[PDB]
Structures are given as structure tokens and as C-alpha cells.
Write a protein that binds this ligand. Structure first.
Ligand SMILES: [Cl-]
Ligand SMILES: [Cl-]
Ligand code: NA
Lengths: 217, 218, 218, 217
């Protein structure tokens, strides 16, 4: 039916930049019907929070850098000076219709200076080895930009297809990411080999960093 | 102290049924309207239903009409969502929310959400293993929370007393069909002698609660 | 733009009848937009009173004989057993739009058994005659139906254009009307003539009735 | 004990201004929305304006935009309708009304209405003349003639006589002045012994009259 088309789907900007998110009603709607457009902010792991209601009213406690306006069937949310804590997905909501519908959302990412990761490596625990599996974990802490390559080597053999990575969402204070790479091996393979190495390539490093350990030392 | 607390989420087989509850405090639902909104993993918000508890008036999204039922019990200050004939596409976090004052069309308070996983697989509790501190004056340490189903797991450190430097990673789905995640923290290397670090793990679906002390190996 | 048309614009029905009034949106409106139609009753010289809200909810304390319903863009108010006190104008109201609009109103009259008027004629008072004007009043009291004809004659001259009528609102208990006809004359004209007569035609009388006086007789 | 009470209506010249007040009790306007609805003599209801007092949000019928302003004072629990540039066609009874609970779109309590008359004509109090009566029932009354503006109220024997009383709607004479009668029917045998007095009040001109009506000699 009537929907909101929200754009762009994502954007990045620097701290202190002004950003503008737009929602358009998907069709022509008489002026005699009110949309009461609301905007919400949703941070990772969290429920949406109300920012703006009835097009342009600032919800109590919301910082004044947020504002909304509406004209015809076009609606915008503006953040007049972007802060790192404003990393979030933002959604509009129209109430022309019952049920009301949400926009598809816009992810706002914070641009910042390059930060190299600190890298750490973790052997499997003796407790895990007892169960017959071995996980080796490599941590890349507090880095920017997101792009990073982690390569595993076991006695100099390149490991391909037996690790999985996970990445945190941009940090709400320093705008960095962290990343784990976990290499899974059988207990028997782990015990056949000596040198376990994680090699990390990132923009903030002049050449790749390796962390390693020797099983049992 | 306005609050909405959801419960009743967890695992359910396709075709099965579940009821969520939303317990309100700090206001009465009698005075307002209650809504359910959902969010499938990595997707947007989808409005589900609304109720005016005082007269029982209800409305529903087309996608749940005839399967779900929203209701309320004003003496308990609680609202509900009865979900029947569940499919995979109903897997989501389900949030309850309200309007306030007489400010229609603005969901001003929301609950924390509860995850509903619609799957044939079985519940499996995790194992918890230390990532033992072995970068300048800072050490990293953690817990590996391994092989559980379904989501979610929660992790805190020293019962919430330790929040700075903590990263709890999103879970990854292994080829086994089980989840795993790590939680790490950076701390001062000089602290490792004297300061106790304990990761507190909870997997509610299997009733697994673990407190694991992580320390330097031998 | 969006308006409601009520029909019929007026009706008479007997006590105990079932009456239904219709309200239709002046154009097609997607199902996705809710009208939240309300119905109001307005009695003479009073504020409207809410009867029905959100299409079909009965407002607290309103008699159960009133009910509403709607299918798509057509809404209906129903009075299951019309009472004499339900004489009123009824209004629907749509809230598709902001501002909401009212229907044009439907006037409901109570049909009762025919009742002839009692007729009285009043000459001008000596007090008024001092002012230079003469009003002659003809009263038709407690009759039904409302239609009545009053003809004035002064020494057998039919009076045309120098009279005005007022009718009461239907009585909320006995469902009758009363009517006054006032003939205005100059003092000088009043004193040139003798016989002042009002002749009443009404369905409850078998032929026209005349009340008269002669000026200066008692 | 929910109550709305309007005041401030009266006679005002074309192009003048007037402010209406609506005093609420039994509830706080800050918990709800307040509305003004008007009704021209003999016509339908016309929605005028509404306000959400807590944040000042207002909306208006097109027919009054730019001329009328709705406002509220939550500390006094009162709402207002400032009306400027009045025209003949703004002549009407003006009602204020509320929503209750969180039941939107249902005007559940209304005030009694206050009449606004927009005209160049001057205030004039009426003259009161008897309609003298001559074991049945007799009719008598009072002719309340030549007044402006509306309204006049008539009672009989200070409120003790209400049975059989008809007070007719006023009619506008070609003079531009209103006239009305009030009649009552009584036992013919009460005529020698029961005093009948009509109490007329034309508030707009501050004119009260008590007129004894008896059989002429
Ligand atoms: Cl909403
Ligand atoms: Cl309304
Ligand atoms: Na005859």
C-alpha cells in the first residue's frame, strides 16, 4: 500500500558533520490525511529509541542536535553535528495507515582516523582439549577501518576453510572495531603440530603482524 | 521507572505455538495502548499488533493475521502475544512498546526484546572455556562460549563490575548447526596477579549458568 | 476531498421501530486507512452526546438499543427499538482526515397517533396598543403531525404576508408539537376593524376550526 | 464531575475580535486534547480547531485559519479560542470538547456552548406583554417582543410551573429584532386564585422582567 521509502540505506560521515536522512511516502496522499511521522534510533543489541514525533517534535531528553521536518509527503531527520555515539540504524515510521509502517532503515557509520589493531593469540585450553576439540583464537582489538585480513598458519601450512571470524559493531565512544578469528582443529591435529601463527594485515600497520605460540611452551 | 519486560521467548518447532508476555510497571496499561514489533535477524522493524487494553480493541499486520493474537490483562498490568502456526520467517526479536500521555503514534518506551527461534533443532547448552592471559602493559583475556543452540547467550564480567575494555562478539553459526562466541577484555598486565576475572555466562534456553574464573596458565 | 454523506437526511418512525441511518464516504479510500467513525446525538438546545465510537463501540452509559457497524466505506447507526426520547439530530464523524468532518445530520422524528390541536386566540394587550403596535396571537397546542395551516382574517379579509409562525421542537415524552401564529398590525389598523379570526386546518380535525374575537368585547 | 464550561460569547461587530474560554474540571487538560466545534443557527456541526495542550500542537479548519487561534493554559486548566476578523458567517454557538482516556477520535464530554453573534445591530432589551386567558383548561402567556441579540430565557412562577409550558423559538422580524412567546395551559378553575408570573431574562441587555398575567377585567 502506502509505504515509506527511506534513503540512503547507509552513509558515513565524520564527527561534527551534518547528516540528513530522508523518508518519502511511496505514493501520493491527499494533504487532508496526516502521517504523524516518527523517527527512531536503534543501537546494536538494543530496542529502538524515539527521537522525533509528529514530524518535527523532539522527544523529551533527546539531544537538540536531532531534528525533523516534513513537507508534502517528504520527511527528513537531521543530525546537525554527528557524534560517535550516534552510530546506529535510524528508522522512520508513517501513520497514514493502520497498521503504521516503518522505513527500511539507514545505517549511519562514523568515519575516523586510521587505528592499527592490537593483536593477541590464544591457545586452546587444556579443558577444551579433554573434550577432543581445539580452538585457537586470534583477537584484533580496537582498529579502523574495518577491512583486515587474518591468515592462520600451522607449522607453516596455510589454513583455509577452517576458521570463522566475528566482528564487533563500531564502538560508540572511539568508533573502532574488534575482530576474532577462531581456528578449529581436532585434538589429534593440534597435537601433531608445533607452531601456531596468526598473521594480520591492516592499513594501520606498515607490514603484517604475526602472533604465534608453540604448543606446550 | 516506566518499564516493559518481555518473557516467553525461546525455541519452538515449526508449526508450534508460543505466548509472549509483556509486564509493565511505572504506568498502567489501562491508560494507554500496547504494541508488538518484531525484527528478524539482521533486518528491519516490522510492526505486528496493537491493543487498547481498556476495551480490548486490536489490530494486526496482514503477515500475522489469523495466527497471532494480542491480548491483555489489566489486573496484572500485562499484555500478551499468542503466536500459533509459527514458521521460519517468524524467527525474530519481539519487542513490546507503548504510547505515553495522550501522544498517539509515538512508541516512547520499549522493552528489551525477546528472541523467538523457530527451528526443528534441539536445545544444546554451551561449554565455557578460558582464553587465558598469556601488548605493552595491557593483557587480553576471555571466555570461549562454545556449541550452543539456539541464541542467545549473555556474558558479563565480574558480575557487571567490569565493563571497560570488554568486547562480546556476535555469535557465529558453525557447520555443526551450533553457535559459538567469545567475550574478551583488555586489562592491566600488573593486575593479573591480584585481580580476579570471572566471566558470567548465561544460556537461558538450556538453563545453563556458568561463572568461569580466567587466569594465567601454570 | 473526503466527506461523509448521511442518509436519509430525515425520517419518522414509530416507537418500537428499528431505525438505521447510513453514513458513506464521498470517495473510495484504501482499507489501509482507518476512519474511526463516531456517532453523536444532538437534542434541541443541547451539546451533542457521543453514542458510538470507532465504528461500533458503545460509549459508556449509552442505551444498548444503539449500535453501529461498518463495511468498507459505509457505516450504519441502528436504533433497535426507537423511544420517544430519541427525537434528535444524529451526526456521524470521520477521522480519515485531519480535520475530521461531520456528516450533514439526520433528523429523527417520532411518528405517533394523530392528535388535534387545541386552539386559542389572544388579542393585543392594552399595554402594547400604547406602543403603536398590535400583535394578535393564535396558539395551536399539543398536536401531531407537525403539518398545520393557519389562516388569518380581519373583517373577512385574508391576511397574507403580515404573520410569522414558530413551532416547538417535538416533545421528548408525548411526541407532540405546538405552534404560534403571530399577526402584526399597526395600532391604527387594528382599531379600524372588528372581527379577528384564525382558522386552523390540521389532519386531526375533520374540518377547519376557527377561533375569533371581536375587538373591544370580553 | 468531568465538566467543561465555555464563556466569553456575545455580540461583536463585523471585523472585531473575541476570545472564548473553556474552563475544565474533573480532569486536567494536560492529560488530553481539547477541541472547538461550532454550529450556525439551524445548521450542522462544523469542526473548528484542536490543541494538545502539553506541547501546543494545533490544527484548524480551513474556514478559520489565519483568523482563529486556539491556545491553552495548563496551570489554569483552561483553553481559549481567540477569534479575529469576525464575519457574519462566524455567527454560531461554539462548543469546546475533549477526548478522554487514550480514546482518540471520540468527543466524549462537551461544554454547554456559548453564542457568538457577529452583527452591526445594537443590543436591545425586549418588551413583555401578557397573553391574557379568557372546569376545563385555559391557555395564557407572555409575548416577549423586539429584542436583540439572542437569547432570552422565560420561566413561569420562578421555576415552580413547568408542566404544560411551551416557550417558542424566537423569530426574526423584518425589523431586524427577535420576538417570541411563552405559553402555558392551566386548569380554568385556577384562574381566580392562582398567580401566574412569567420571568423573562435577556442577559445581553441586562433586562429582567417579571410579568403577572391575569384575566382582563
Ligand atoms: Cl506507533
Ligand atoms: Cl474528534
Ligand atoms: Na366545519
Amino acid at each position: 500500500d502506502i509505504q515509506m521509502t527511506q534513503s540512503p540505506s547507509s552513509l558515513s560521515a565524520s564527527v561534527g558533520d551534518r547528516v540528513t536522512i530522508t523518508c518519502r511516502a511511496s505514493q501520493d496522499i491527499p494533504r487532508s490525511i496526516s502521517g504523524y511521522v516518527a523517527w527512531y534510533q536503534q543501537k546494536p543489541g538494543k530496542a529502538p529509541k524515539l527521537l522525533i514525533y509528529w514530524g518535527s517534535y523532539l522527544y523529551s531528553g533527546v539531544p537538540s542536535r536531532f531534528s525533523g521536518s516534513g513537507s508534502g509527503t517528504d520527511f527528513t531527520l537531521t543530525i546537525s553535528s554527528l557524534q560517535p555515539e550516534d552510530f546506529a540504524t535510524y528508522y522512520c515510521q508513517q501513520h497514514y495507515t493502520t497498521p503504521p509502517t516503518f522505513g527500511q532503515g539507514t545505517k549511519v557509520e562514523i568515519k575516523r582516523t586510521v587505528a592499527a589493531p592490537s593483536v593477541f593469540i590464544f591457545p586452546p585450553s587444556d579443558e577444551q582439549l579433554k573434550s577432543g576439540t581445539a580452538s585457537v583464537v586470534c583477537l584484533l582489538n580496537n582498529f579502523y577501518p574495518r577491512e583486515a585480513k587474518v591468515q592462520w598458519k600451522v607449522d607453516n601450512a596455510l589454513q583455509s576453510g577452517n576458521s570463522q571470524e566475528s566482528v564487533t559493531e563500531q564502538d560508540s565512544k572511539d568508533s573502532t572495531y574488534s575482530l576474532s578469528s577462531t581456528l578449529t582443529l581436532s585434538k589429534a591435529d593440534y597435537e601433531k603440530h608445533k607452531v601456531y601463527a596468526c598473521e594480520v594485515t591492516h592499513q594501520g600497520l606498515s607490514s603484517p603482524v604475526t602472533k604465534s605460540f608453540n604448543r606446550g611452551e | 521507572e516506566v518499564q516493559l519486560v518481555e518473557s516467553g521467548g525461546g525455541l519452538v518447532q515449526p508449526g508450534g505455538s508460543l505466548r509472549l508476555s509483556c509486564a509493565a510497571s511505572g504506568f498502567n496499561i489501562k491508560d494507554t495502548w500496547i504494541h508488538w514489533v518484531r525484527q528478524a535477524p539482521g533486518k528491519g522493524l516490522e510492526w505486528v499488533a496493537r491493543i487498547y487494553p481498556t476495551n480490548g480493541y486490536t489490530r494486526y499486520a496482514d503477515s500475522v493475521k489469523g495466527r497471532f493474537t494480542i491480548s491483555a490483562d489489566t489486573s496484572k498490568n500485562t499484555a500478551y502475544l499468542q503466536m500459533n502456526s509459527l514458521r521460519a520467517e517468524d524467527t525474530a526479536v519481539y519487542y513490546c512498546s507503548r504510547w505515553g500521555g495522550f501522544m498517539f503514534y509515538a512508541m516512547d518506551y520499549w522493552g528489551q526484546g525477546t528472541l523467538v527461534t523457530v527451528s526443528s533443532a534441539s536445545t544444546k547448552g554451551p561449554s565455557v572455556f578460558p582464553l587465558a592471559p598469556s601488548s605493552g602493559g595491557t593483557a587480553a583475556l576471555g571466555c570461549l562460549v562454545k556449541d550452543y543452540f539456539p541464541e542467545p547467550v549473555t556474558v558479563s564480567w565480574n558480575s557487571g563490575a567490569l565493563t571497560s575494555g570488554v568486547h562480546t562478539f556476535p555469535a557465529v553459526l558453525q557447520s555443526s548447526g551450533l553457535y559459538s562466541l567469545s567475550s574478551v577484555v583488555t586489562v592491566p598486565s600488573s593486575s593479573l596477579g591480584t585481580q580476579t576475572y570471572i566471566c558470567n555466562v548465561n544460556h537461558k534456553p538450556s538453563n545453563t549458568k556458568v561463572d568461569k574464573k580466567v587466569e594465567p596458565k601454570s
